[PDB]
Write a protein that binds this ligand. Structure first.
Ligand SMILES: [Ca+2]
Ligand SMILES: [Cl-]
Ligand SMILES: [Cl-]
Ligand SMILES: [Mg+2]
Length: 662
């Protein structure tokens, strides 16, 4: 069986000639994915592996578009060819299953659909046999983070030959010697275990499902489908970025009217604890006090921020909060945090309190309190909650039905279901969720638009204490790996880079000031933090104006140029909403440890309109180690026929507001 992208450049061949069912993929008539196996093994049920033959293919196609409630673009185009391939094996130990393939111009998705059949009752998958066999893997280069490690998704990216990537998380991005870029991920991860990629024979990446503590991967009753497995393929790195395949593979919005989900910018009592000017726990330096929260709310109201995150408001942080998962209350504030007074103040200022639920990995202590916790927040006019699951890999703690503690993975079926339960319950209270230590993004924000963002990668917080902090290349890695999954709460915008001393050997963002501004356009999220202390923004009002101006919701987004681990340039057009007319464009560019010159055409600007570019760029002598603050701000009249030379300092960047003129 064969299915091709609409333009014909991607071609998938599905076969039954090998030991098992298999597929392969060519791009512009060069094989990029060799024969790759399909099937399952189960704990007790007979395997779905060899001796299955193709009995039927069903071809169809799609050419449609749909609108996002919020996002990186307003209109999403869905154009693909589709084939459902049915496999059958005769008895004894026979069976049948289908695989559905969708071929887009930017990549392919496939999933298994196992129908009701005699003897398929309560089953437990122990292995998914799916492979991604990369052709010419000996000359390919990969950019990856290890899977199953003690620190979950929070690793800096490795740059290695593809054959060195032994056990990796997705999105898993690499390029072959021809320059073709490929990224493997998954979409609509629902009631199933996350896929890790395990390199077997060289270049053969086998699905490695994250298991329950008991050792099985996925529990199902009867007929079941898998999540989609996705293979993005493009001639350029930015072709991976500019694809909507992950969203297109998810089910449409199930929450109805989601106008109560509000993209916007926020600040927080947060960074002070990470740089040790405040504590999460009670005492003389407690961050989460009524007085401090009102001070942040006044600042937010004055400078145009929608909400104030406050961490450490609830009892249980005293001591070493990493070990306090059993004792957190999600309804009882500390005595110095007057939530009723802050509810009144939020209505008086128009600035909302943003809630915070850190579990330190104990999800049963959270689950038992969750209904009361969201009721309190709904009563308190709280519309967004940041959740947290800080614990080492494999050390989620749950209490089973017999009262016995078990350890689970953040990305097993158990936690996949746990996260979605939290999001669905929050939606009943009109609360949106920002998940730290999450399951990776698989596009479910389409289906549940209150799941607005997540962390699931090293963000700004590692620049306070990472030892070492994130390297200069980190953003340009994220843009082509983690960010292919969906939005990230990076918490950009640190203006005081000197709190631990300057130079290359201290814990600090290893960037220039202009790169901190560029992050607001480079890293998409519907909510963007201005992460720093308010007084640090008051010290730099001209630079702060960009953060005040920049939206977080976009009618269109275009990655204009870039290279993995080196640089990226984004242009985005604001969505018409709230104070934004919908006419302004924004640009952000960042580099790695190297200074870089990038030539950019402005032909993305609307034809026939004049713009005033407000350009925030590295000063002539800027360099991140000892001169990160040199900054130039320039105004320049431009149109679509103009061009721009970006001059990025070492770990530098540029941020631009293109203000449409009447
Ligand atoms: Ca974290
Ligand atoms: Cl994580
Ligand atoms: Cl960084
Ligand atoms: Mg580089």
């Amino acid at each position: 069986a064969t299915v091709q992208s609409p333009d014909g450049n991607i071609k998938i061949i599905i076969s039954d000639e090998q030991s098992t069912p298999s597929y392969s993929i060519s791009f512009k008539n060069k094989t990029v994915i060799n024969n790759s196996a399909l099937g399952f093994e189960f704990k007790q049920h007979a395997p779905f592996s060899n001796s299955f033959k193709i009995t039927k293919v069903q071809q169809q196609s799609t050419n449609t578009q749909w609108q996002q409630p919020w996002g990186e673009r307003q209109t999403v185009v869905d154009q693909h060819n589709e084939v459902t391939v049915t496999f059958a094996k005769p008895q004894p130990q026979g069976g049948t299953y289908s695989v559905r393939f969708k071929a887009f111009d930017s990549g392919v998705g496939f999933r298994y659909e196992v129908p009701k059949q005699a003897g398929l009752n309560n089953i437990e998958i122990t292995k998914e046999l799916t492979e991604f066999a990369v052709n010419n893997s000996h000359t390919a280069t990969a950019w990856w983070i290890p899977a199953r490690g003690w620190n979950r998704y929070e690793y800096v990216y490795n740059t290695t030959p593809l054959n060195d990537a032994a056990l990796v998380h997705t999105p898993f991005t690499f390029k072959n010697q021809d320059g073709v870029h490929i990224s493997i991920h998954e979409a609509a991860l629902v009631d199933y275990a996350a896929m890790v990629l395990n390199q077997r024979r060289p270049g053969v990446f086998q699905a490695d499902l994250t298991p329950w503590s008991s050792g099985v991967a996925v529990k199902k009753q009867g007929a079941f489908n898998t999540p989609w497995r996705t293979i993005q393929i493009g001639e350029k790195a930015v072709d991976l970025v500019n694809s909507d395949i992950i969203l297109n593979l998810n089910e449409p919005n199930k929450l109805g009217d989601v106008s109560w989900v509000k993209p916007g910018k926020y600040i927080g009592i947060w960074w002070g604890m990470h740089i040790n000017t405040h504590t999460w726990g009670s005492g003389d330096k407690h961050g989460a006090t009524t007085k401090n929260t009102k001070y942040y709310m006044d600042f937010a109201a004055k400078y145009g921020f929608d909400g104030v995150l406050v961490e450490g408001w609830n009892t249980g942080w005293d001591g070493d909060w990493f070990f306090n998962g059993d004792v957190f209350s999600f309804t009882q504030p500390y005595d110095d945090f007057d939530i009723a007074a802050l509810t009144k103040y939020s209505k008086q200022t128009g600035v909302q309190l943003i809630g915070h639920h850190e579990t330190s990995g104990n999800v049963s202590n959270y689950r038992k309190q969750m209904a009361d916790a969201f009721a309190l927040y709904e009563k308190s006019n709280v519309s967004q909650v940041k959740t947290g699951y800080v614990a080492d890999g494999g050390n989620i703690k749950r209490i089973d039905k017999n009262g016995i503690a078990r350890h689970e993975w953040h990305d097993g079926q158990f936690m996949v279901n746990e996260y979605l339960h939290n999001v669905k319950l929050a939606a009943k209270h009109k609360i949106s969720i920002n998940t730290h230590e999450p399951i990776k993004d698989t596009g479910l924000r389409r289906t549940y638009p209150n799941w607005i963002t997540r962390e699931g990668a090293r963000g700004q917080e590692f620049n306070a204490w990472g030892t070492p902090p994130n390297p200069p290349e980190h953003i340009s890695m994220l843009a082509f790996t983690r960010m292919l999954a969906g939005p990230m709460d990076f918490t950009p915008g640190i203006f005081d880079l000197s709190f631990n001393g300057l130079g290359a050997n201290t814990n600090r963002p290893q960037t220039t000031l202009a790169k901190q501004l560029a992050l607001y356009v480079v890293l998409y999220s519907p909510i963007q933090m201005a992460a720093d202390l308010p007084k640090n923004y008051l010290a730099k009002p001209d630079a702060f104006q960009f953060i005040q101006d920049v939206p977080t919701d976009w009618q269109q987004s275009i990655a204009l140029d870039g290279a993995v681990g080196d640089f990226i340039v984004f242009a985005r057009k604001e969505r018409k909403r709230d104070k934004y007319t919908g006419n302004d464009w924004y640009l952000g560019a960042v580099t790695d440890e190297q200074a870089r010159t990038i030539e950019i055409s402005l032909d993305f600007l609307d034809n026939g309109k004049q713009f005033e570019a407000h350009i925030y760029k590295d000063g002539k002598n800027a360099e991140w180690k000892n001169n990160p603050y040199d900054l130039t701000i320039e105004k320049r009249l431009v149109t679509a026929s103009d061009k721009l030379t970006l001059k990025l300092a070492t770990s530098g960047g540029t941020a631009i507001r293109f203000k449409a003129l009447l």
